[PDB]
């Protein structure tokens, strides 16, 4: 009601890459595709919220 407005011109996605060596980043790739090396995470709040 108070006349505030937001308008999106453009959105760009950025992604910073560690310049890892191509034998090191291929060893790390091959280790992290094994199902025992799955990256498991956790919500910090960890709650169902009612």
């Amino acid at each position: 009601v108070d006349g505030a407005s937001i308008k999106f011109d453009s959105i760009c996605l950025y992604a910073t890459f560690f310049p890892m060596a191509h034998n090191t980043a291929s060893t790390l790739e091959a280790m992290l595709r094994n199902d025992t090396n799955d990256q498991s995470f956790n919500d910090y709040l960890s709650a169902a919220n009612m």
Binding site: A21, H22, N23, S26
Partner: protein, 288 residues
């Protein structure tokens, strides 16, 4: 023939075609059609080209060899470094002016003797370059006159070392010895590094031939250069100079097989896929 001062003078004064004076037989084989390849190539010329070659054949034209005899001399002076290549036109007009003031039957014969003399002197210098011995043997034997021929201890090691010292300057045509003030030196190549000091090395090795932290690093540079020209029986086994000459022969042989090992490891580290910065540093730290 590319370094022949009269072949080079023929490529700068004589025509590149078949005139009937320098090449009389080769043009009479073509006028008279007795050539193997294309005999009938002379009948297919106009009368201006065909009759003007017959007239130069049945009565040929005389010529001056004087500009060709002098240019063979100038192109040998410029080749044996007697003149500069910029002075090649200056001394050519200077010699043509002298053989024009003093022209005779004696001088034109004497220029004919001297263009055979400079063919030899160009080839004699180029043989002496590839042999590479005459400037070094007269200055290494001049060095060894200064050094005494009788050390107190270890004369057997000393007279085989100085005989192997004559073997470097003989079996390496680029190596040379000279003098610069008091001392004499030894370069392993023309305009190259590893210059040892002979007068400082033999005043260091004198007193170490029978000893069985104390060596100047140019003496050790001399013991590195003399190592492939020294047998196991040329010096002793227990003597500290003889113990190092075997140790420097193993160091050359290990650096000769670490050279071939380097060319193998870096070849299979590019195809396997590594950092090209770290493939070249981890290999040397494995080899050094």
């Amino acid at each position: 023939d590319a370094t022949d001062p009269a072949v080079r003078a023929a490529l700068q004064s004589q025509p590149s075609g078949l005139n009937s004076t320098d090449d009389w037989r080769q043009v009479m084989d073509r006028i008279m059609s007795l050539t193997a390849r294309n005999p009938d190539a002379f009948r297919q010329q106009p009368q201006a080209n065909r009759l003007s070659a017959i007239l130069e054949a049945v009565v040929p034209a005389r010529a001056n060899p004087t500009h060709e005899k002098v240019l063979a001399i100038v192109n040998a002076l410029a080749e044996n470094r007697a003149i500069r290549p910029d002075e090649a036109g200056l001394v050519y007009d200077a010699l043509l002016q002298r053989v024009a003031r003093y022209n005779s039957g004696n001088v034109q014969t004497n220029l004919d003797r001297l263009v055979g003399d400079v063919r030899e002197a160009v080839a004699q210098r180029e043989r002496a370059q590839q042999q590479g011995n005459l400037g070094s043997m007269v200055a290494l034997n001049a060095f060894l006159s200064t050094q005494p021929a009788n050390v107190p201890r270890g004369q057997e090691d000393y007279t085989n070392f100085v005989s192997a010292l004559r073997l470097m300057v003989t079996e390496t045509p680029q190596s040379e010895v000279y003098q610069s003030g008091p001392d004499y030196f030894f370069q392993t190549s023309r305009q190259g590094l590893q210059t040892v000091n002979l007068s400082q090395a033999f005043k260091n090795l004198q007193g170490l031939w029978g000893v069985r932290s104390l060596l100047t690093p140019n003496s050790r540079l001399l013991l590195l250069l003399i190592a492939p020209f020294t047998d196991s029986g040329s010096v002793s086994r227990d003597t500290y100079l003889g113990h190092l000459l075997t140790l420097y022969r193993e160091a050359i042989g290990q650096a000769h097989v670490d050279e071939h090992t380097f060319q193998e490891i870096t070849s299979v580290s590019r195809a396997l896929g590594q950092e090209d910065t770290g493939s070249l540093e981890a290999t040397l730290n494995y080899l050094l």
